[PDB]
Amino acid sequence: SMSVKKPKRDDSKDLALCSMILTEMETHEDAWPFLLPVNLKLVPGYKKVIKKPMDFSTIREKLSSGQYPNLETFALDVRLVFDNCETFNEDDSDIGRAGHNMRKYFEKKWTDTFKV
């Protein structure tokens, strides 16, 4: 509360650590469905069904331009890429499998870096 804080966490490396994490996502073999915005002209249903499209290049533009105020906001956009993927793709498809694989990959790094 007012004049009563928890001990200050060093948050000065978070930008760099999120960039590193995102670079590891971008270069994974199964990232290809997520690297660019889905082409809303070319994919029927996407625009109406997916209320908040998201992708790695958009995440990278946001991060590099100071648009995440904190860690939580960066991890919300990352998860949204996979939440979207699940909403739109069957689990038993190449892209649905990529999505599951990339979330797992993300969450491990996310825990190793900021939890453990």
Ligand X SMILES: CC(=O)c1cc(-c2ccccn2)c2cc(N3CCOCC3)ccn12
Here's the x/- map for ligand X, 3-42, by CB under 6 A: it reads as -----------------------------xxx---x----
Minimum separation from the CB atom of position 101 to ligand X (A): 13
Q: Does 113 interact with ligand X (rule: CB under 6 A)?
A: no
CA angle 5–6–9, rounded 5-degree value: 120
The helix/strand/coil state of 61 is: helix
By beta-carbon distance, which residue lies closest to ligand X? 33
Residues after which a C–N gap over 2.5 Å breaks the chain: none
C-beta of residue 57 within 8 angstroms of C-beta of residue 37 = yes
Minimum separation from the CB atom of position 61 to ligand X (A): 17
Determine phi and psi for 40, rounding to 5 degrees.
-70, -20
Here's the x/- map for ligand X, 50-89, by CB under 6 A: it reads as -----------------------------------x--xx
